[PDB]
Amino acid sequence: LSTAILKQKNRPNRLIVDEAINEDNSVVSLSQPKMDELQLFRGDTVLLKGKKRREAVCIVLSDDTCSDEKIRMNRVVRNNLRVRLGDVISIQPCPDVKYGKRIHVLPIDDTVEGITGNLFEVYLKPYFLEAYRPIRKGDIFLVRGGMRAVEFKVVETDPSPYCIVAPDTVIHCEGEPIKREDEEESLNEVGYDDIGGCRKQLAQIKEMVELPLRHPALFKEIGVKPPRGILLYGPPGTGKTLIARAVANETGAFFFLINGPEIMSKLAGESESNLRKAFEEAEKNAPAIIFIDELDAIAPKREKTHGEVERRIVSQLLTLMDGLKQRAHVIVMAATNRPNSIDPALRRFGRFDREVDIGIPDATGRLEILQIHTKNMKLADDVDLEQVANETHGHVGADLAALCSEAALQAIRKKMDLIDLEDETIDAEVMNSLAVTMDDFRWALSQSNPSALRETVVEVPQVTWEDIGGLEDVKRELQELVQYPVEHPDKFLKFGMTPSKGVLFYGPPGCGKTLLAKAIANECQANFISIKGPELLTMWFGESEANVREIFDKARQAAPCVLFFDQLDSIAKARGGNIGDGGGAADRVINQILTEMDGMSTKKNVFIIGATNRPDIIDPAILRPGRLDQLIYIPLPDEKSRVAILKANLRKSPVAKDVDLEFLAKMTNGFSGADLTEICQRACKLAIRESIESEIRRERERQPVPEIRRDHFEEAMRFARRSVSDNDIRKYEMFAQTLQQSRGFGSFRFPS
Amino acid sequence: AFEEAEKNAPAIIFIDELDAIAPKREKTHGEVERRIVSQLLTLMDGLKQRAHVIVMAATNRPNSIDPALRRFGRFDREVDIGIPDATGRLEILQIHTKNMKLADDVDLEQVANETHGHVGADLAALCSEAALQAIRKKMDLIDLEDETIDAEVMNSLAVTMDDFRWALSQSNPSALRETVVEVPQVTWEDIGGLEDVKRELQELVQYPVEHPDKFLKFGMTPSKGVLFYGPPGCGKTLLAKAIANECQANFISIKGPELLTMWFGESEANVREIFDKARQAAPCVLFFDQLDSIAKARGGNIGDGGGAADRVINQILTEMDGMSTKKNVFIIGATNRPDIIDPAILRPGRLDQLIYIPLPDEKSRVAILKANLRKSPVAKDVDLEFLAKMTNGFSGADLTEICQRACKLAIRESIESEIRRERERQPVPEIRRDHFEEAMRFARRSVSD
Amino acid sequence: EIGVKPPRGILLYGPPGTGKTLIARAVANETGAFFFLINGPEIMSKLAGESESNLRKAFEEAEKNAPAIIFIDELDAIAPKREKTHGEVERRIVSQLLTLMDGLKQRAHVIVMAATNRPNSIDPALRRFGRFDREVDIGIPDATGRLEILQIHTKNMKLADDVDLEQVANET
Numbered sequence A: 001l002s003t004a005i006l007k008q009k010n011r012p013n014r015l016i017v018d019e020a021i022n023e024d025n026s027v028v029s030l031s032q033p034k035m036d037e038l039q040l041f042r043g044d045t046v047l048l049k050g051k052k053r054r055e056a057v058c059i060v061l062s063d064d065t066c067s068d069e070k071i072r073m074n075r076v077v078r079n080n081l082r083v084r085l086g087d088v089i090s091i092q093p094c095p096d097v098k099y100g101k102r103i104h105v106l107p108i109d110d111t112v113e114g115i116t117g118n119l120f121e122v123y124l125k126p127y128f129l130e131a132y133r134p135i136r137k138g139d140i141f142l143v144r145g146g147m148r149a150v151e152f153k154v155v156e157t158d159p160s161p162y163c164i165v166a167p168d169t170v171i172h173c174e175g176e177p178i179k180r181e182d183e184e185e186s187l188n189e190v191g192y193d194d195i196g197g198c199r200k201q202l203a204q205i206k207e208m209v210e211l212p213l214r215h216p217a218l219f220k221e222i223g224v225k226p227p228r229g230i231l232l233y234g235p236p237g238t239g240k241t242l243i244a245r246a247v248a249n250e251t252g253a254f255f256f257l258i259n260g261p262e263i264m265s266k267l268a269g270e271s272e273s274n275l276r277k278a279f280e281e282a283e284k285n286a287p288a289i290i291f292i293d294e295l296d297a298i299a300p301k302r303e304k305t306h307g308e309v310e311r312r313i314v315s316q317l318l319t320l321m322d323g324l325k326q327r328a329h330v331i332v333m334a335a336t337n338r339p340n341s342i343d344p345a346l347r348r349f350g351r352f353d354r355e356v357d358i359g360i361p362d363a364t365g366r367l368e369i370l371q372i373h374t375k376n377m378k379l380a381d382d383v384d385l386e387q388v389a390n391e392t393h394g395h396v397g398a399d400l401a402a403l404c405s406e407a408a409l410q411a412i413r414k415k416m417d418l419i420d421l422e423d424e425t426i427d428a429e430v431m432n433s434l435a436v437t438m439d440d441f442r443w444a445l446s447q448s449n450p451s452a453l454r455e456t457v458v459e460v461p462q463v464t465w466e467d468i469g470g471l472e473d474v475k476r477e478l479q480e481l482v483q484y485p486v487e488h489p490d491k492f493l494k495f496g497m498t499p500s501k502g503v504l505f506y507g508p509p510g511c512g513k514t515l516l517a518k519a520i521a522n523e524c525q526a527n528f529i530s531i532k533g534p535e536l537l538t539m540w541f542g543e544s545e546a547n548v549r550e551i552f553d554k555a556r557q558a559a560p561c562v563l564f565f566d567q568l569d570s571i572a573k574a575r576g577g578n579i580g581d582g583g584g585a586a587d588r589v590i591n592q593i594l595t596e597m598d599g600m601s602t603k604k605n606v607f608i609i610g611a612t613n614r615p616d617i618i619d620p621a622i623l624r625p626g627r628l629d630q631l632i633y634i635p636l637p638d639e640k641s642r643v644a645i646l647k648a649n650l651r652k653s654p655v656a657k658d659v660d661l662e663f664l665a666k667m668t669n670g671f672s673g674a675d676l677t678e679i680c681q682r683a684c685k686l687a688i689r690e691s692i693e694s695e696i697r698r699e700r701e702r703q704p705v706p707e708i709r710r711d712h713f714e715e716a717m718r719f720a721r722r723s724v725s726d727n728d729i730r731k732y733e734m735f736a737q738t739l740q741q742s743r744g745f746g747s748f749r750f751p752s
Numbered sequence B: 001a002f003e004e005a006e007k008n009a010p011a012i013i014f015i016d017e018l019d020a021i022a023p024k025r026e027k028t029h030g031e032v033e034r035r036i037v038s039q040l041l042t043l044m045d046g047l048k049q050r051a052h053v054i055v056m057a058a059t060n061r062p063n064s065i066d067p068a069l070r071r072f073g074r075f076d077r078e079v080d081i082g083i084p085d086a087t088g089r090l091e092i093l094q095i096h097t098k099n100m101k102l103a104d105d106v107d108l109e110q111v112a113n114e115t116h117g118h119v120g121a122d123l124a125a126l127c128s129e130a131a132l133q134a135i136r137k138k139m140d141l142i143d144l145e146d147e148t149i150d151a152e153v154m155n156s157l158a159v160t161m162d163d164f165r166w167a168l169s170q171s172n173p174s175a176l177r178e179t180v181v182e183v184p185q186v187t188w189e190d191i192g193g194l195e196d197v198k199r200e201l202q203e204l205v206q207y208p209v210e211h212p213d214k215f216l217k218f219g220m221t222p223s224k225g226v227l228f229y230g231p232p233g234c235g236k237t238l239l240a241k242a243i244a245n246e247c248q249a250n251f252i253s254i255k256g257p258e259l260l261t262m263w264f265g266e267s268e269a270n271v272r273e274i275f276d277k278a279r280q281a282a283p284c285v286l287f288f289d290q291l292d293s294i295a296k297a298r299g300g301n302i303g304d305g306g307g308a309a310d311r312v313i314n315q316i317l318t319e320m321d322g323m324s325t326k327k328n329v330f331i332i333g334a335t336n337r338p339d340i341i342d343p344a345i346l347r348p349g350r351l352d353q354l355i356y357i358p359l360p361d362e363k364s365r366v367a368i369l370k371a372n373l374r375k376s377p378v379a380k381d382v383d384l385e386f387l388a389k390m391t392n393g394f395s396g397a398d399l400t401e402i403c404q405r406a407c408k409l410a411i412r413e414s415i416e417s418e419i420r421r422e423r424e425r426q427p428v429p430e431i432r433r434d435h436f437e438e439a440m441r442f443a444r445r446s447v448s449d
Numbered sequence C: 001e002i003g004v005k006p007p008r009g010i011l012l013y014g015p016p017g018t019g020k021t022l023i024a025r026a027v028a029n030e031t032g033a034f035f036f037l038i039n040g041p042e043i044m045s046k047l048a049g050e051s052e053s054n055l056r057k058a059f060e061e062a063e064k065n066a067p068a069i070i071f072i073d074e075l076d077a078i079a080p081k082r083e084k085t086h087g088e089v090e091r092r093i094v095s096q097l098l099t100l101m102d103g104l105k106q107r108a109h110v111i112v113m114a115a116t117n118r119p120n121s122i123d124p125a126l127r128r129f130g131r132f133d134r135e136v137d138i139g140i141p142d143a144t145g146r147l148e149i150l151q152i153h154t155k156n157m158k159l160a161d162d163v164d165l166e167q168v169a170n171e172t
């Protein structure tokens, strides 16, 4: 019901835009049954609606090729109406068109160059001679002939704007030629269709700025005054200023733009004078819309503001929107990154009554955004925008635009050999072959990350699941953890349960916790934020808690996101055991983490993963299911896992075939993964020492070791040691057996 | 302005936003602002000899006004335009709905009773939102692209009780707009066990507003403080969610450490502001999840730290003592570490009620398992009673984890079947006995003895 | 012809001495576009509204001479996080920069470049796409890179025949 405004409902007037085979710039062709339904005779002047407040006039024609549900037009009228292929436009009979007395015509500057003959005589005179072609202001049409075809833009027509060009009517092309960039920018205008995702938000905005203007009679009849204030808030890059541009481009209302800091002035009372001048200019202009970009810049809380000028400006805004004298139907929109920074008196019904959340788009929303951004791009056949939409988990639309731009720039980079920057021009063949393919989009996807996570970007050493030896069950569980809620949510909605979103890795040092986190960061299809434990702590009072809150908010925005704490035992610990820690800053941080993982806020697809050497000291509430639901124990590998670890370390290593890894794994009882990696590194280093001494011998005689042999591994094992002791294993197994006793029974079976 | 008022007397001078030009001259930094405050004080003093000039001013920050203006002789009288009660809200709705095309089925008394913290601008917003919902309902008949409309649409267009109920669902007090947080939809049947706790909470939240005359008769004021303490995962925050969703009262859900700020004196200001907006929204439930973050034992931070936490807890106790019996603000606290709460928080008149949320028992565990599985397709031959008997010391979170892991295994099996059919070409409608057994094989007790 | 706009915002970052201001100087010297230099601090003024007025004047001047490049040296000085900065005249200059870089009216041919030793202290809304499209890490050079730097610096010097810059590069 919210998007009821948006639906077209398939009215008869709308017809699909189609290519016209023979119709010239001033005529259109429609099917005979469709005209019979519309009661239109041949040659009738018919008015065409267009997007962005554009309209076109043409002469209807009876075409058998044209379908009843379609209208055939050339590119000229399509340009005039600002529409693309497959769009639906209105047609209505145009009443009382009067023959023109005089029209002022201006050509496009890029066309006028290279034409020695007079443009009016060569082009306009034969084109318009006995033409009987209706024209409208702002309509760009093309005339063939001469060396180069010269487009003509009719700036002025009389009677304004509907007239029929006739031989008696005076036509002239004298004046400054229209800048090609001006017409291009007119084409490059934002509309409600250029807004992707946020369909309900756009529906609300259209109900609140477009609906009262189109049909005031609704609100005069039902006897209510529509909302007069819009606050757009969301993370940066979600489309707040884009929605403002769309509204400005395609509303008949007067639009006044206020940029936040532009109000400020050094003179006393000059800022308030600027605000009053803006509001008075809007009020003079009947229905008007005032957009205040960056509202939080000039609307801070009066109680928290220190400077008097800022508070006086906030008060001026307060009295302007809702004071003793009421606004004369002036719509006030504003956009802000920080809605909670705004003065609370502004956020009531009289001033900013409706707050619209332009949030992070979902998969379908971001597919729509990708289609909008690539509608003008040249895409190859293998491009698949649905897959790109699936991959980009945290992107907000500015990130999608960045992805498309980087894909196109990669497509251009593929042509560097054929293109020389010293060369003044590029070949036609290079222009034709240049296009964006799926490979470029995949590369851009590899480069792309959400902008909100730029601050939390950490280089991960590119570990793969195969780099980890053993831990097959843990690998499967981590992959399922990250994948099932993302790719298969309807399964959870069918079974009616939310996914678990927490895992704790506890085990001896060197056994593969951080390695599993690296494998997740590289292989899992989710955003990844990596946190060293004590990095969130700050000297200031309340700032460590703010850092925890901020990192959790970043994870929430970028969902599905994996939040990894490499050393959980630092930031999370049992409360009440720290004598100092500031003023209980450590305990307050723990409580903040507790409220973040499980509080009264709704749950998102944020997976918190923690690794700890010593799991006994972590706060018991942190371990509670719903916060780190699963406690995974990463123990010392057994012989099969030791074989797998040794093989995973030596896969790239050129190692002798006669080297026996099974014997090594058998002898290395009690060794961790770091221990076996150390054995392999020692063997590599002994081989390198041997090769260096052989090369030194060759150099001396002038004035070897392709692979790692059994003797190298023998000596490496001779210097090998066991890193984790039996007491450490005893305490880890003690924690594991406490959990096992918590299970309460050896085997659970339902009675038969 | 004052001279023009005197020339045309009797006169009334209305100073809208008085705090814009009347800050405390001591706190004022600018010379022109100070000179203006002094000039306005001088004009107010000279207002005595003025024959018929009366100055009326309005401000929403009365405290920020310079105190010298609030002595006697200048701005002598102060009128408190407060938050309207139920009958006041009904009067405001009658005023704002007199031009509306109200249907017959509407009862503005119900709309007045539902809106608790609304101040009158929120009631106008409710009327506007309801009328816009009414227009939305007819948007199928009339498309926006239509330049003109049928008259039968005008005849059809009117505001019904469904529209007011929709606006009621959408409506939130403007005061609580900065504090609003999305809360999961939880009902009292979503909670299993704690029947006595549910009844006691409903009594504490309902009786002081519905029957204050009873408390006046017996002379005993209702308690305005609750403390939830218990093992983690046992349902304190679940009860808070249920109260937020079901109870007919405003809810302010605030974590502990978000009030704290590095700037000196901002944390106490935040505490004052949250309690003030709790008063403005009464009947309001003020909930502190993890109470021990802001309310911790005094003397611990005395030795180590700046000392702002003690100031915070002092301001909290001041705010709790400030609110009177008549104002209906219920302060609920929850902590899984009761021992590290400051006992001053616990003393009578402040969080007096102490409710312990224990580890659930066998009947409670059956109730918890049934509540978790009410919306899940489960095999008839699954026995929740045996699950409750086998899970002796499990908390509610542990049982929910059992159910979630059973769901995960069922989803894994369904995906396996999908992959099998896809591979062979080129199932699991409900959770069963074996899924629950395999989930139990991983089960653990969150809370130790 | 490909159907996209080129990226228009560049944030160079790295430790001191890597060559961010050197790269800015090279770009200014060897591009055929109106180059505007903004120093971070110099915009600031004690007056209210003067500093963002300076930013508006600079961006408008770059607009009037298009195509243009604006270089904002020491961006962290002029662009701290709004959530962190307390003073109003800092929040306001950051908001002005945000509006100038991507607002309801978008700069057409202006390329805004910046250099910061610390990129995290920059306000996150600036690190967005539409403002600062791509961030380039000018990092510590390798042995070959530092050999190239030594060759660049010693091209003007007179070096004896025994001079071997390869060893000097290997040692530093």
Ligand SMILES: Nc1ncnc2c1ncn2[C@@H]1O[C@H](COP(=O)(O)OP(=O)(O)OP(=O)(O)O)[C@@H](O)[C@H]1O
Binding pocket: A194, A195, A196, A197, A198, A235, A236, A237, A238, A239, A240, A241, A242, A243, A335, A336, A337, A369, A372, A396, A397, A398, A399, A401, C102, C103, C125, C128, C130
């Ligand atoms: N929903 C969307 N659909 C299509 N394009 C979008 C959408 N959201 C953003 N964009 C594009 O990405 C960029 C985002 O800039 P925009 O001005 O819309 O963001 P914003 O919400 O105002 O952000 P900021 O808080 O930084 O001001 C623009 O280039 C815009 O074209």
Ligand SMILES: Nc1ncnc2c1ncn2[C@@H]1O[C@H](COP(=O)(O)OP(=O)(O)OP(=O)(O)O)[C@@H](O)[C@H]1O
Binding pocket: A467, A468, A469, A470, A471, A508, A509, A510, A511, A512, A513, A514, A515, A516, A611, A612, A613, A644, A645, A648, A649, A672, A673, A674, A677
């Ligand atoms: N299962 C494994 N397969 C392959 N390599 C492993 C494995 N376990 C550990 N390693 C090796 O151990 C080293 C890093 O160990 P890792 O970071 O995983 O330890 P950790 O368990 O997180 O320990 P810590 O508590 O000390 O941080 C790497 O050399 C890695 O190759």
Ligand SMILES: Nc1ncnc2c1ncn2[C@@H]1O[C@H](COP(=O)(O)OP(=O)(O)OP(=O)(O)O)[C@@H](O)[C@H]1O
Binding pocket: A594, A598, A599, A621, A624, A626, B190, B191, B192, B193, B194, B230, B231, B232, B233, B234, B235, B236, B237, B238, B239, B334, B335, B336, B357, B367, B368, B371, B372, B395, B396, B397, B398, B400
């Ligand atoms: N009585 C109950 N009925 C149904 N589910 C319950 C019950 N008690 C707990 N749960 C489940 O366990 C979790 C409840 O955790 P909750 O946040 O309520 O605990 P808490 O007592 O506030 O703990 P903490 O102090 O550790 O945050 C939810 O997943 C909920 O589904």
Ligand SMILES: Nc1ncnc2c1ncn2[C@@H]1O[C@H](COP(=O)(O)OP(=O)(O)OP(=O)(O)O)[C@@H](O)[C@H]1O
Binding pocket: C014, C015, C016, C017, C018, C019, C020, C021, C022, C023, C115, C117, C149, C152
């Ligand atoms: N890559 C380089 N190649 C050649 N010379 C270099 C290079 N990097 C730095 N230099 C030399 O070092 C000098 C100082 O470097 P520069 O001023 O560019 O540093 P910066 O990274 O901008 O530092 P700052 O943080 O002080 O702004 C340059 O003028 C130049 O002489």
Ligand SMILES: [Mg+2]
Binding pocket: A240, A241, A293, A335, C102, C103
């Ligand atoms: Mg913006």
Ligand SMILES: [Mg+2]
Binding pocket: A513, A514, A566, A611
């Ligand atoms: Mg580690």
Ligand SMILES: [Mg+2]
Binding pocket: A598, A599, B236, B237, B289, B290, B334
């Ligand atoms: Mg809780």
Ligand SMILES: [Mg+2]
Binding pocket: C020, C021, C022
């Ligand atoms: Mg420099």
